[model samples]
Structure formats: structure tokens, C-alpha cells
Target: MVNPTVFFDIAVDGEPLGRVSFELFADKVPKTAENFRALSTGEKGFGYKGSCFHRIIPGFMCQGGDFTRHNGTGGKSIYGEKFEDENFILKHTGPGILSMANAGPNTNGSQFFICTAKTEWLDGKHVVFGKVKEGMNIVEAMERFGSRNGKTSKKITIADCGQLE
Candidate 1:
């Protein structure tokens, strides 16, 4: 009974981070998973391919995935609006935990953050949809190049992503 895993190849300033992957919790959070899946695939012509990791904190987390604006200012759902939050049952206890980034409650959209370390403060505020299956060191490396103004010195892109076979 294996669950699905999605693979994303990340790049910083067009340099590859090889491959990083995640196993989603679809059963516990179906809509959020579907939202991420659709955006990652660009099924409707919108995806993460050209986005930047807008915000990075050295020992905390790395946040990005706002494809439209490249910064943290913009994001949208596949349905063209903000969506309600999924129950925050997953713990933000370690690196590679993927959680929805939002302005407030139930505002999940295209933006997401990957924790580079334990973040107990975010435990109940964000929706944790997936956990990084590999390439956590890459996430940490990205954190090393933390951005000012939420934009990296060299843009990092999601590059390519899809369901792992």
C-alpha cells in the first residue's frame, strides 16, 4: 500500500539541485494535494517551472512557489481564488516538511514553504501536505543562500516536476 510521490528538480541560478521528492498525504488532505499536483504539472498552463524561492531563512525554512509574481506577493489556486485550509495535523518538526504559505487562515494558494529545521512556532498555522522524501540537504543549501527582499541573488527555479513512477 504505497502512497504517491511527486518529484521536483530544483535549480539555483539555473544550476541543478538534482532531484528532490515528496510523498503526499492525499487521504488526509485531498484538495490541497490536488492543488499542488495541478500546479506542479501546469495542467492549465500555470506551474512552478519559473518561480523563485522568495524567502529563505538559514536555520528555519525556505519559502517560494509563487509562479505568477516570483516574489511572495502573488499566488492563486487552480480555481482562480484562495482556498480553505486543510487540518494541520502534521508536525513541523524537521527539515523538508512542505506546508502551505498563506496570509491568514484558509488562504492556501500557490505559495508553499519547506522547513529546513524544526519550527514549532508554525505547528498550527500552516497546512503540512507533504514531507520531503530526499534532497533535504539541497533544501538546506538553498537556505544558505537566503534572500533579501524575498528574492535570491540568483533565481532558483523548480525546473521540472511530476509524479514519480
Candidate 2:
């Protein structure tokens, strides 16, 4: 929790998918991280397995993480520690960058999106926990396959997850 550099391996089917990593700023968003870390484990981590990138904007970004597929939907938007200002680390420059999918402040849950493009406006707004470390190809390939709408590939899943050394 101190390092802020966290990585999540996002896989599909049963292969080495993409490594979603992030530089979490807990000091800035303790409330957000507290909820996120809790959500990131034991049958209910926001890692978002079995879900496909619901929306893929060829020139912009991709969105997914609906709980309906592998337990999608019904997730509550969490409230963080309530920082008056933002403490973001990751930027939406391209593929691999991760940010929260929120309806508004403190509405973040298991669903998040990645901006294959640079999302400058999102900085300090969305809680950026991790980004893709390796296997962007898999994410790219996945982006090529799944439906643009949320919960297209009902079978798509994270496949596997673990901490990196």
C-alpha cells in the first residue's frame, strides 16, 4: 500500500493477458484506495475477470467491467476517505493506464476503464490505482473480439491473478 505501484495481470480464457498496473496514491485518495483494496480480493476483487472491454473506441479508449458477466452488476459505488484534493499517479496516455469507472465522486466500484489515448482531464478526478504492465497484445486482441457494449463476452474472465516481484 505504501509503494503505490500496483500491478494486476488481466487475462482472458487461460492465457497471459495484459498486466494492468497502477501507481496508487493512497495518501491523496485514502478513501478510494481503502474501498478499492478491499474490493480487490477473495471472490470480489475489482480486478474484473471474465469481463470484456464493453466499449472500444478505436481512436480513444475501451470500457468494461460490468459484474453481470462473471458476477457483474449489483456492485455498490464505494466512498473513500474524502480528500478535498486529488492525489493521482497514473495518466491515461495510452494502453495499460487504468482509471475508475464512476458515475461521480465516490461512485467507483469493480468497473474501470483504460484510455488507450491520453486522458488529461481525468487526472486527479478518477482514482488511478494501476495500469497494464505486460501483454497489451492480449488486451488489444481482446479489444478486437469483445462487443463494444458492456458484458458482451459472458465467458470472458481475468483467468488468473497474482503479485509481481
Candidate 3:
């Protein structure tokens, strides 16, 4: 039960792009992973549906998960408030790696970002709990987003998300 894989069905403006999965390192970052799992599966009503990819940078990564504001400034944990950082040992060395996007240390909310390239500078800053197991192309194909860009070419929405059996 340390490393469970989760599945996220993705879409853009109601167009399905299929599912993307990621295996979580629960052993290393149990609290962080659990928070994400709950938010993703809607167990606590803070799910990923309707959430948009608020920010995107080509050859870099796509950042989203602000279900409240849909901008980069909203969203709370399943716990109903901001949580402390679970700084486990992981590196953002490549694309598809799911890392927590925080304001600063120990300020992790529901916001997160997927690395689209090797960002070595983020090794100790952000926590990487999982990586894309499939549909890397879908992530790569995301419409470019400028700073504070409201929407992607296609609205990136999480159709469904849950723990994979």
C-alpha cells in the first residue's frame, strides 16, 4: 500500500483525450500522496473535475489543480486548509513527473504541476510524488499557455480520477 497507481481521465473543452495514470510514492510521501488521492478521487468533495490547467509553458510543464479559483490562487486540501510540505527525496528530472506546486516551503495546497522537462532546480523545492504512466503525448499536446492565461486551446479538465486497481 506504499505505492499505489492512480488514474486520471482527461479531456479538453469536453473532448476526451483518454486517461493518464501515475504511480504514487506513498512510502516516501504518504501525507502528500494521500492528500492528492483524496482530491483526485473526490472522496472529500475537492476533486479534480472542472479544474482547468491554469498555467502552461511549452517544453516545461502544465500547472493546475486550483478547483476553487481556477486561477493559480485557490484550492485547499481535503483537510480544509493549507498543509505542511512532505519533502521526501525525489527529483524532477524529466517530463510527466507530478510534483506539488506550492507558494513556498510547507505551503502546499491542492495545486500541482506536471514536469514536461528536466527541471533540476526544483529538486529540493517541490515534492515529486508520481509521474505520468501514460498519455504523455496528451500532456505534450496541450495548448500553450501564457502567464495568467485563462484557458488552454482545449480546456484541460479531469473527466475522472481514482485509484487504479
Residue 4 displacement in candidate 1 (angstroms):
2.6
Q: How good is model 3 by TM-score?
A: 0.89
Per residue, candidate 3 scores C-alpha lDDT tens digits across 1-165 of: 657778778777778877888877788888888888887778886667667677887767788887887668777777767788777588897888888888888888788888888867788888888788777877777635323353455567788888884
Span of 10 residues, lowest total lDDT, candidate 1: 147-156
User: TM-scores of all models?
Assistant: 0.90, 0.62, 0.89
Q: Which segments of candidate 1 are over 4 A away from where they belong?
A: 147-150
lDDT of 1 by residue, 23-132 (tens): 77777878778788777766768766566688887777788876777558567888767798879888788877888888889888888888777777898888888888
- The Cα error of candidate 3 at residue 54, in Å, is 1.0
* Local distance difference test, each candidate: 0.78, 0.53, 0.77
For candidate 3, list the clashing residue pairs, or say none. Answer: none
Off by over 4 Å in 2: 4-28, 43-52, 68-74, 77-90, 121-125, 147-155
Tens-digit per-residue lDDT, 57-81, candidate 2:
5435556666454333324434432
Model 3 worst lDDT run, 10 consecutive residues: 143-152
